[model samples]
Target: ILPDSVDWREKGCVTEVKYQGSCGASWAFSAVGALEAQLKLKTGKLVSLSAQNLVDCSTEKYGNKGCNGGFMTTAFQYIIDNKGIDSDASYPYKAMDQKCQYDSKYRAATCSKYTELPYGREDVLKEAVANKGPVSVGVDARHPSFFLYRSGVYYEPSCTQNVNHGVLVVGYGDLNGKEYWLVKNSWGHNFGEEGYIRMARNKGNHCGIASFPSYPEILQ
Candidate 1:
């Protein structure tokens, strides 16, 4: 069960990470985004989340050796079937290590995350944002600005980002006389509004995040 201290989902602080040049890895990145939010809210500690785990382990279920563009849910399945992966501290990142973190003794994982109400367009918006906590969402962006957005308390993208990965929704506020939703990103701390971005609520971008998805695979 989640602790009672923190709740980022309520503020809609979730967002999608830019898959960038990496195609299939988008699935892995998105999964990490959601788990990172849960880790933060549950622990009240902000740390550089891991994408290496996603990139490395995501190769199996989706079927392929490198980033082949798989479903984001498939990445979650990697975690569930693998009984949860170790943090970057354990696996570490070399940017190019196709080897498995676990030995042959234990490869297939089998653990599960607790989730409710399969998410879909505004499906978990009220529950996660209005009630649950910061929920990570996914959608199709067009470029790097939306992917590497700079600032604004509220979210309002130009629909210039590409389609890949997932992100967390922080909350809602107005910026430059425009209403938007606050989004959390995962391109490290060097990009966007301190690793955050904003998208217009009424626009397709905000709705893109809000209406994107919340389908937590839950390792079922």
Candidate 2:
């Protein structure tokens, strides 16, 4: 039976918080977070991978548009095809579109495969995260409230599937009795709850997060 909650952070799986910084590269961070968690789950090592790598190299082949925006699946495929990714301390983050500078010296996490959960299936997403690790998710974070979010279980009736931003669902729990999905964002630690947000859960795919849940299997 699945527990009522699970935080990858408490499981020694989460890494240092990230900062995307004016870049629309949340997709890369989201994808990287999933892989990082899986790596820790599989090998007990929490390495901070490079989002800049995906921001630069995942274009064309996987349709990742770099800072302009992209998809989590493409980022996953790029890592798998490229065999591995680098660490943030090596390649680093430029927060803008840059030329591909993938170096073998900075490699950190290596992925073998990835899978996207079915759209509009909360059950599937919950099961995946409960059984696996944190999953990459897409959400329409274009609303003003999303930016001004401070605390509490964020629930917006305007949340839609026209997803433009990506984030990671690290766990699930309730705040003040309201169910929420613990989401990790790349907007720096000063953003919301130290760069984290407890989003509304169990309400017909709230924020479209359950619409496109996915995760990568790290190469062991």
In terms of lDDT, the best-performing candidate is 2
Structural similarity to truth (TM-score) of each candidate:
0.65, 0.97
Q: Pick the candidate with the highest TM-score.
A: 2
lDDT by residue for model 2 (117-177), tens:
9998988888888898899999889999999999878988888877788999999987778
Q: Residue 195 lDDT in model 2?
A: 92
| TM-score, structure 2 vs. true | 0.97
Model 2 gets an lDDT of 0.89
Error of 2 at 93 (Å): 0.5
Q: Which runs in model 2 stand beyond 4 Å of their true positions?
A: none
> What's the CA error at residue 60 for candidate 2, in Å?
1.2
TM-score of model number 1: 0.65
Whole-model lDDT, candidate 1? Answer: 0.51
Encode model 1's per-residue lDDT on 1-220: one tens digit a residue.
3232233544333333343343345445555666655555555543334456666666755563445555445666666666665554455444453656543233222225634333343434544654445555665555655655566643434443344546665555556677555566556565677666666654544435654445342222
Candidate 1 scores a C-alpha RMSD against the true structure in Å of 6.0
